[PDB]
């Protein structure tokens, strides 16, 4: 079997069904004591929680689901009627994420889009009845952060006030994206210093609020 399968099994045998909180703790425990995995983690996760609470978004778009850690993290805090759409190109990971959401009992709030962000973003308004996004969580391959941000803007998916939250702006780093948003008058950026998931290495999240053209 695979690492992702082992994590899922760990959650089923250790977490409490329908309890998003126990699911998160089960995953963090497994990754802290058995195998490192690219989940955003609890340190950065707590910062995410605080940002979600402040903005209370109704429509959130996540780029990069993996095993569903951050999706469960964000969805558990969404207000009734809110929706979370998450894109995952690896069909194997998308399957795990779906199972993770089901076990957490958050399957009704989340919709998994299986495909590459560059191919799916142009189809959001048409196929998923999306006007504009309240918040976007960037956490897929780092070289896609800038091009996908430009794609979201081109397709008119961003509006004044849309919050973009990006992971790993320090480690592994996202050079072009970070330079672009911090230098553009279209974005108001704030940096939250934290730590790389399951490690003492310093990393951080960048919050970039779209101001419009
Ligand atoms: O950190 C990485 C990748 C970087 N990598 C260096 C090695 N390191 C690690 C493990 C055990 C042990 C040791 C060592 F033995 F060196 F100590 C090192 C694991 C991590 C990372 C993090 C993310 O949040 C992402 O979204 C993301 N994406 O999307 O690609 C990538
Ligand atoms: C770090 S993992 C996401 C982990 C998740 N954010 C969490 O906090 O647990 C990044 C995911 O990006 C996804 N992937 C990479 N590039 C993608 C793209 N352009 N569109 C969709 N999925 C992509 C990968 O398949 C990978 O599972
Ligand atoms: Mg990450």
UniProtKB/Swiss-Prot annotation:
Needed cofactors: Mg(2+)
Species whose genome carries this gene: Rattus norvegicus
Gene that encodes it: Comt
PTM per Swiss-Prot/TrEMBL: The N-terminus is blocked.
Positions in the Extracellular compartment: 1-213
Full protein: residues contained: 46 to 258 of 264
Ligand binding (Mg(2+)): 139, 167-168
Claim: Metal-binding is one of the keywords in the record: yes
GO terms for cellular component: axon; cell body; cytosol; dendrite; dendritic spine; glutamatergic synapse; membrane; postsynapse
Alphabetized GO MF terms: catechol O-methyltransferase activity; magnesium ion binding
One GO BP annotation of this record: response to oxidative stress
Residue numbers binding substrate: 142, 168, 197
Annotated family: Belongs to the class I-like SAM-binding methyltransferase superfamily. Cation-dependent O-methyltransferase family.
Binding site residues for S-adenosyl-L-methionine: 40, 62, 70, 88-89, 115-118, 139
Range of residues in the leader sequence: none
Cofactor note: Binds 1 Mg(2+) ion per subunit.
EC number(s) given by UniProt: 2.1.1.6
Protein name, entry field: Catechol O-methyltransferase
Keywords: Catecholamine metabolism, Cell membrane, Cytoplasm, Lipid metabolism, Magnesium, Membrane, Metal-binding, Methyltransferase, Neurotransmitter degradation, Phosphoprotein, S-adenosyl-L-methionine, Signal-anchor, Transferase, Transmembrane, Transmembrane helix
Catalytic activity, as annotated: a catechol + S-adenosyl-L-methionine = a guaiacol + S-adenosyl-L-homocysteine + H(+); 2-hydroxyestrone + S-adenosyl-L-methionine = 2-hydroxy-3-methoxy-estrone + S-adenosyl-L-homocysteine + H(+); 4-hydroxyestrone + S-adenosyl-L-methionine = 4-methoxyestrone + S-adenosyl-L-homocysteine + H(+); 2-hydroxyestrone + S-adenosyl-L-methionine = 2-methoxyestrone + S-adenosyl-L-homocysteine + H(+)
Free-text function comment from the UniProt entry: Catalyzes the O-methylation, and thereby the inactivation, of catecholamine neurotransmitters and catechol hormones. Also shortens the biological half-lives of certain neuroactive drugs, like L-DOPA, alpha-methyl DOPA and isoproterenol.
């Amino acid at each position: 079997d695979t690492k992702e399968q082992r994590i899922l099994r760990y959650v089923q045998q250790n977490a409490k069904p329908g309890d998003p909180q126990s699911v998160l703790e089960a995953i963090d425990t497994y990754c802290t004591q058995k195998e490192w995995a690219m989940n955003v983690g609890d340190a950065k996760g707590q910062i995410m929680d605080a940002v979600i609470r402040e903005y209370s978004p109704s429509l959130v778009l996540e780029l990069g689901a993996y095993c569903g850690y951050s999706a469960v993290r964000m969805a558990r805090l969404l207000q009734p009627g809110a929706r979370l759409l998450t894109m995952e190109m690896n069909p194997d990971y998308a399957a795990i994420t779906q199972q993770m959401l089901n076990f957490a009992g958050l399957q009704d709030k989340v919709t998994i889009l299986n495909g590459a962000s560059q191919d799916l973003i142009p189809q959001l308004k048409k196929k998923y009845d999306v006007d504009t996004l309240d918040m976007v969580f960037l956490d897929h391959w780092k070289d896609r952060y800038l091009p996908d941000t430009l794609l979201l803007e081109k397709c008119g998916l961003l509006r004044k006030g849309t919050v973009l939250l990006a992971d790993n702006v320090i480690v592994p780093g996202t050079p072009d994206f970070l330079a672009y948003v911090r230098g553009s008058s279209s974005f108001e950026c704030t940096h939250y210093s934290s730590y790389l998931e399951y490690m003492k290495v310093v990393d951080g999240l960048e919050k970039a609020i779209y101001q419009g053209p």
